[PDB]
Design a protein around this nucleic acid. Sequence first.
DNA 1: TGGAACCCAATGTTCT
DNA 2: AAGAACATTGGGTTCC
Lengths: 75, 76
Amino acid sequence: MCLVCSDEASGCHYGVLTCGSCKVFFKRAVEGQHNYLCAGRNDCIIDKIRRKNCPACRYRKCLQAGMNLEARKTK
Amino acid sequence: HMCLVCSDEASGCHYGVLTCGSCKVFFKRAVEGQHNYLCAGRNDCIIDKIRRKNCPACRYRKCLQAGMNLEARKTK
DNA sequence: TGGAACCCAATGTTCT
DNA sequence: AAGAACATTGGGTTCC
Ligand SMILES: [Zn+2]
Ligand SMILES: [Zn+2]
Ligand SMILES: [Zn+2]
Ligand SMILES: [Zn+2]
């Protein structure tokens, strides 16, 4: 199960086990951008169905689960 | 002259309520189609120009609450 | 694993 | 006003 949206947990992307959709969301969130504002209370439910609803909260728990575009762990 | 649903400036009065054009076609699509949306918050999401896209469930709710309806035509 | 390339759903504007 | 057509966005899977 994906540590963010708990969809089809694929295989560690950018440090964390995630679905494919969260993988791509995160690269996009970091590289491009958009300020994402939560419309609730910064604690939205992020599941398969709702991850689309709050990119702010989804992106936040990407960061908190450890996601990073650097697998430079090679050193 | 602001949309009663989302606070973006209203483009006139639609389905019975002062609204912008985004909320106008949003409400029409939701009412005529399916609107089985789920709130990822507590069914009171703030709905402004940007966040209106976040939560269709709370957006539709605010539409109904402000009184929008399709037959506001022959309802006059 | 990472990412280009789709495809697609859902939204917002235009309609000399 | 109401709504069809079109344009775009942002997003999820598919392919290497
Ligand atoms: Zn996920
Ligand atoms: Zn949120
Ligand atoms: Zn509006
Ligand atoms: Zn909501």
